[PDB]
C-alpha cells in the first residue's frame, strides 16, 4: 500500500532512496544515515521529540511513503532534509552528523534521479 503519483515511484523509492542513504556513508567511511538509522516513536521517546523540532529518520520517511503521508517523494525528501535537520539538532556539532546529514539529502536526490532513469529505460 503506497499509491501516490505512481505506486512504484513511492514504493520503488521506499527501497531505493531509503536504502541508498542508509547504505550510504560519509567521507570517513561510515554511514551518513548513522544518526538517522532509527527514529523512536514520536511518543515513546518524547525527549528526542522534545529536543528536535522536526524529527524523522530514513525509517520514518519510508514509513510515511507507504502510509500515504507523502503521495510524492518530494515530500519524503523534504523529510529527508528534516532527517538531516534532526541531525544538527540531536547530535553534536563538529561531528560527522552534520556533514553526513547534509550529504544524505544530497545522496537522496542523486538516487532520486538514477531511480527515475531506472524506471524508464
Amino acid at each position: 500500500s503506497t499509491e501516490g503519483s505512481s505506486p512504484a515511484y513511492l514504493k520503488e523509492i521506499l527501497e531505493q532512496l531509503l536504502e541508498a542513504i542508509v547504505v550510504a556513508t560519509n567521507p570517513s567511511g561510515r554511514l551518513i544515515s548513522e544518526l538517522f538509522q532509527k527514529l523512536p516513536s514520536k511518543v515513546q521517546y518524547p525527549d528526542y521529540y522534545a529536543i528536535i523540532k522536526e524529527p524523522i529518520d530514513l525509517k520514518t520517511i519510508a514509513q510515511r511513503i507507504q502510509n500515504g503521508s507523502y503521495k510524492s517523494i518530494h515530500a519524503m525528501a523534504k523529510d529527508i532534509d528534516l532527517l538531516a535537520k534532526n541531525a544538527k539538532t540531536y547530535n553534536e556539532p563538529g561531528s560527522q552528523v552534520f556533514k553526513d546529514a547534509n550529504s544524505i539529502k544530497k545522496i537522496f536526490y542523486m538516487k532520486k534521479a538514477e531511480i527515475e532513469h531506472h524506471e524508464m529505460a
Binding site: 556513508t25 554511514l31 548513522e34 544518526l35 547530535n91 552528523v97 553526513d100
Partner: peptide, 20 residues
C-alpha cells in the same frame, strides 16, 4: 532486524570518524 532481546552496541556515540 531483531528476532529477540539483547544485542545492543551503543556505549558512547556512533557517528563516523569516531575512532580510538
Amino acid at each position: 532486524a531483531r528476532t529477540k532481546q539483547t544485542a545492543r552496541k551503543s556505549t558512547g556515540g556512533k557517528a563516523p570518524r569516531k575512532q580510538l
